[PDB]
Amino acid sequence: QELGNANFENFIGATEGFSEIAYQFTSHILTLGYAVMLAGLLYFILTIKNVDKKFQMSNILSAVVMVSAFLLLYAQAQNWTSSFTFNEEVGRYFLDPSGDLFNNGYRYLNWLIDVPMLLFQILFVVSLTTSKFSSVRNQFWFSGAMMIITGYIGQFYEVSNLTAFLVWGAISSAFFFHILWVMKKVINEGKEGISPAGQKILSNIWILFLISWTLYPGAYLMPYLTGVDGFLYSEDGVMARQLVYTIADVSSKVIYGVLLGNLAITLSK
Amino acid sequence: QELGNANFENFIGATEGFSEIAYQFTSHILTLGYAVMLAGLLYFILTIKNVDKKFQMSNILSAVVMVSAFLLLYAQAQNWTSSFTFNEEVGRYFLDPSGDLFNNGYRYLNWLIDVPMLLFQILFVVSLTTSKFSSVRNQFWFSGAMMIITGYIGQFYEVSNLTAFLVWGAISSAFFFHILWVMKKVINEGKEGISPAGQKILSNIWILFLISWTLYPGAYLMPYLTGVDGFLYSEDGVMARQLVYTIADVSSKVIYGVLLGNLAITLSK
Amino acid sequence: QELGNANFENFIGATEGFSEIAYQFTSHILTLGYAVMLAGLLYFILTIKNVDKKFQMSNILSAVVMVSAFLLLYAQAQNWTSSFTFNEEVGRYFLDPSGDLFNNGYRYLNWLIDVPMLLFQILFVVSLTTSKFSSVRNQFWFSGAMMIITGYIGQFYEVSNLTAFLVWGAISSAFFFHILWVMKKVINEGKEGISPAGQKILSNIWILFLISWTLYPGAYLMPYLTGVDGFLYSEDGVMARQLVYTIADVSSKVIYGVLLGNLAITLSK
Amino acid sequence: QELGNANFENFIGATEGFSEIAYQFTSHILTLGYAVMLAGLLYFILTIKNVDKKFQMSNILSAVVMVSAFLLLYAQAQNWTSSFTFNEEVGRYFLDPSGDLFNNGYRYLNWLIDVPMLLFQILFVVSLTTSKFSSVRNQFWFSGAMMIITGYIGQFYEVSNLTAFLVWGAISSAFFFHILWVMKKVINEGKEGISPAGQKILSNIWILFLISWTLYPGAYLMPYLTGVDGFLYSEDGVMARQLVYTIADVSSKVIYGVLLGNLAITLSK
Amino acid sequence: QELGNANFENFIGATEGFSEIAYQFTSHILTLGYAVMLAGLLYFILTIKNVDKKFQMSNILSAVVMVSAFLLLYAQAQNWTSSFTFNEEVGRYFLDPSGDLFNNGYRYLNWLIDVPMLLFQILFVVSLTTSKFSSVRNQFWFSGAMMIITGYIGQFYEVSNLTAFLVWGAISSAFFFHILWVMKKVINEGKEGISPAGQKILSNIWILFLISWTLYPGAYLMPYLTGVDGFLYSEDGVMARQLVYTIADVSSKVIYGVLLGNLAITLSK
Ligand SMILES: *C/C=C(C)/C=C/C=C(C)/C=C/C1=C(C)CCCC1(C)C
Ligand SMILES: *C/C=C(C)/C=C/C=C(C)/C=C/C1=C(C)CCCC1(C)C
Ligand SMILES: *C/C=C(C)/C=C/C=C(C)/C=C/C1=C(C)CCCC1(C)C
Ligand SMILES: *C/C=C(C)/C=C/C=C(C)/C=C/C1=C(C)CCCC1(C)C
Ligand SMILES: *C/C=C(C)/C=C/C=C(C)/C=C/C1=C(C)CCCC1(C)C
Ligand SMILES: CCCCCCCCCCCCCCCCCCCC
Ligand SMILES: CCCCCCCCCCCCCCCCCCCC
Ligand SMILES: CCCCCCCCCCCCCCCCCCCC
Ligand code: NA
Ligand code: NA
Ligand code: NA
Ligand code: NA
Ligand code: NA
Ligand code: NA
Ligand code: NA
Ligand code: NA
């Protein structure tokens, strides 16, 4: 059977199949995913009147990210349970084509709209010094878009064409480093003028941002991190990838938004 | 196989079929579609108290457009994934009649109610000079309705009867030019009396409106933009059409609404 | 094939079947239906603080009508697409019994709870003179209930027993005329004491009410308006009936509610 | 065919089957059911600021009842349409085991949480004289729980074991009479100290409570009210039972809550 | 038939099958579950302005727990009805593999985000004396996470490997005792400085917490509480487990949250 330009999850499910644990876990971690986003949406809305009017735009953007995040991730959780059916004879879940092939695309388009908002909301809490608001914003939005788009193309060839998969991943990485660079400037200029408490938080935000955002490219390579025909090129790699995505999503959106809220309160009078 | 007066998407899916990329992409772009609309709905509601009471009717109408836009576009996303099933032997998605034929109708009825509201909300932010409120409104609502209705009829014959398809498309275009004419007047009269900042925004609103609204008729012809049996009369044309629709929808409703909100704030005291 | 006491839509779908246009259109018009109701619900809630506390009960009842309307009309839209499946050989949608027979019952029960509220809410905007509030209310609620119940019974025999269908329809009409009579009194007494502007609106409300409410009995007979084996006793009659219902529903609930809101503002200080 | 300890609806659907009217009606009355509850939820929330802060706890509990009532009753509606499929040959709906057997359980668990809240909310509007708040509450909550639990057990044997069905029904009745007794005291003590207007309402509340609550045990016996192999032990009895439940539910929750709201306003200053 | 590392519910359903009562009851108790959580969500939101701003964080966290709880518990409910189909011949519900194997995982990952919030919210109502806020928080969050994770692993081997099932259960218990220890300290330090009324409530909160939290490990062993081939290793054990979980969930989240709210009011001025 020819799957073509499909994610490696389909190849594992079509050949070896998934064990009760592998399948169930992936379902639970994706379910917990959209559950956290709807819980976060409620939090950011109920805590809007806890910061000065000038910082409230941060809670609004956090809520915007949560909504879309819930819908896309909710669909992604359905794309999984629908693409794999249990085989009584062997007692493993195999690719059910009638439910469509599983694709990490829904999550990539969730980033396309999130990335821009996540990078833009910090500009409503911190105050730039030598950098222009419009300038920083435009850089984030451009590099952010190019990073997602290029990566979205590569993930389609993560099996069919390993070369194209890495080339696009590399190009994407380029824009990723540029974002890290601009964000570093914003953090530094943000620390200037605020209390030691506010600086302490911005320091934590930078570490969170650095680690959480690095997990994404990690999940992208997950199936080949132990080389071809490696330990991760199995159902173990599938669990690992979806787990890492879930950890990254919660950290980069929910926790990131909570810290911005805490900073907003610290600067509130 | 007899399809009758059906959209060209069904003909491609019934003959050639769709590749993993073509099918998946179309699913992601439609999913992102309704996701953005629900995110926008939340934004316009949370920012109502950011403008004077006289301009708040603009945020309310934007929210009204988002709601309906979310429901119709959601149904459209389901109409896709349901109409095409994966074939293991060849590894392509083919027309699954049990899920009903795919039709871009749901999107046409979303416009019918939207168009009127989108054209009417700007009349709550800007002040007419040499034009009567009721007069302008009646023109938008009439031409707007005729434009959608005529187009809705033609799209059914985009394959079965190319002649009827173009004739209706032409008639529709007539009312489209009339709307562009009236909107141009509204923008000009709107600039008179407001600050240079407000004028700057109205200038951007006009450009956005002109480009975003022109994309629709482009998506209408998409399958024949490279002539019959052309490059676009394939799964590539299907992807292009649904992508263009999504770009147009986000720009004409969400972004258009954000700019109106920004102008409202600029005129707020 | 034995259908028994079923709506004529089932007979057309079981014999002739539905064309792509006939089926798709009916789906779009029903979809637009519930979409408008959810858009209206949001409008009436966001405009509650736009009228004096004494008139706000009108917006609340409008919202109550929208909710129930959305659910019932949504269920109806799903009932249609479920009752008819596409036949590849002939290329037409035929009755799929596994999805249950299509019935206009969900809409008849939507009226049962709506009619009472729609007639009751106007009594919170206008002021009676010689008529008692309780008296008028009791008449509307009684005649309203009997009108819906009797009609609900008749619609089951619109094919199986043409006699019973007309007899019940006639009895129903009796209570309909009584409602028109009481509503006429309410409008007259309502005009006395209010400004010419308020009177202008009440005049428009009466015209809207008269036309929109008359469309329902029109949709009831739709299949026989061109006599037995007539032009309307086809898929054309099916489209016509569902279209008329949608126009009537939007006019009698949403537009009727918007006009009452405008009158409330006119009388607000 | 072996059904075991199943509701009589399954036996009628498995043997005689259901006519278009019997099936459709049951679907409409259950649909109207959950529709009314969501409409009521919106009403109680939008009218919270219409009574003094001390009475607002009544609207909150009414809203709590509506929510859970909507979800359960919605699940009960789905349980119906899924358990019975149309047979083309005979033209009647028969038991479809793949959709699970129909059980009035979802409604019995809705009461388990509702009953306690419905009996408890009246204690926030009226003022006891010689009776202790905590004492009355504890009695309602205990007798209320025992009444539902015992009844829930009996309904499982309404066909399999007529003896057990009546024994449990009898035990349940015991706790029902005790509730009627305590509620009567609460009404009397409630009338003392309030205006004649408030007393008028409490009188209506007592009548509503007495009739609406008595309908439940009536629906419990519905299939045997005309003795075994009687007129009601048919599809007619099924329609009657689900109709009675719907009337009881709307009256005991929505109407009961509206009257409490009216009384709260009467006592509000 | 090979099930592998699956929950015991699947083994009972695959061999003996489930009776109408066993299946129906499990469905009702799980349905009531998510219904209570959505009812609680509405309560905590509508009662936020009933306590001083400093205690409102307790209501917000209660609402956060309700949301996630509703989504996960809803999924768990669907997982049940989908995994077991009725067999006409024997008249019992058997494992339907096409609907996936039933797993109590969705409820476990629900505790993962809940536990931390439930232990953290009490720190916003009570005031520590000799214990550091950050210190107590970190202990709860760590032990809480390890307790859930370890237990989540063990529940997969509750049949396949009884040894691993008990070992993990034991390790989990270790962290459970540590949580009970820290919570005991928090309660004691919380009682110091507050009124006798507040102390009375904290005493009730401690009893509720102790009993409700102990039920979980009880549901974990439920199938072996009467040893292998025991009375509980049947459909009776399945009902018991899901019942206990539901009672524990309502007590540990909803009731626990209500008491914290009542304590907040007691300390409010
Ligand atoms: C909430 C969503 C977030 C934070 C998304 C972040 C996405 C990235 C940081 C993506 C980066 C990638 C690369 C650097 C290379 C491979 C492809 C990507 C897109 C995964
Ligand atoms: C949010 C929805 C919007 C802005 C819809 C706009 C629709 C049009 C501008 C449609 C125009 C068309 C023509 C000019 C010719 C072909 C048919 C149409 C309807 C696509
Ligand atoms: C929003 C719902 C509304 C306004 C419903 C109105 C319903 C009617 C006016 C029904 C009238 C009928 C007759 C006069 C005879 C035939 C049967 C009816 C019920 C369609
Ligand atoms: C909104 C829910 C309400 C008011 C539920 C009420 C339920 C009862 C009054 C039940 C009574 C019963 C008996 C007295 C005997 C038979 C079994 C019951 C539970 C139906
Ligand atoms: C609302 C969710 C709550 C309160 C969850 C609580 C969970 C536990 C107390 C779990 C404890 C366990 C053990 C002590 C051993 C067996 C495994 C667990 C996780 C069930
Ligand atoms: C004030 C607004 C100005 C914003 C400037 C830049 C932000 C928009 C980002 C969108 C750019 C995406 C373009 C994609 C290029 C095509 C990718 C093809 C693959 C190489
Ligand atoms: C106050 C902010 C810092 C929080 C730190 C306190 C601890 C909370 C996070 C706990 C993380 C648990 C992760 C478990 C590790 C892997 C589990 C292995 C399975 C045996
Ligand atoms: C301060 C209030 C204390 C009570 C609240 C806690 C409520 C939980 C009640 C415990 C009862 C659960 C026992 C269920 C029986 C199921 C059979 C178990 C078989 C081993
Ligand atoms: Na599956
Ligand atoms: Na598909
Ligand atoms: Na309604
Ligand atoms: Na269909
Ligand atoms: Na309920
Ligand atoms: Na059915
Ligand atoms: Na949860
Ligand atoms: Na089932």
Numbering used by the authors:
A (entry chain C), B (entry chain B), C (entry chain A), D (entry chain E), E (entry chain D): 3 to 271
Task: Tell me, in the authors' exact words, what the paper reports.
Microbial rhodopsins (MRs) are transmembrane light-sensitive proteins, found in Archaea, Bacteria, Eukaryota, and also viruses. MRs are composed of seven transmembrane α-helices (A–G) with the cofactor retinal covalently bound to the lysine residue of helix G via the Schiff base (RSB). Despite this paradigm, the first light-driven Na+ pump KR2 was identified in Krokinobacter eikastus in 20132. KR2 contains a characteristic for all known Na+-pumping rhodopsins (NaRs) set of N112, D116, Q123 residues in the helix C (NDQ motif).
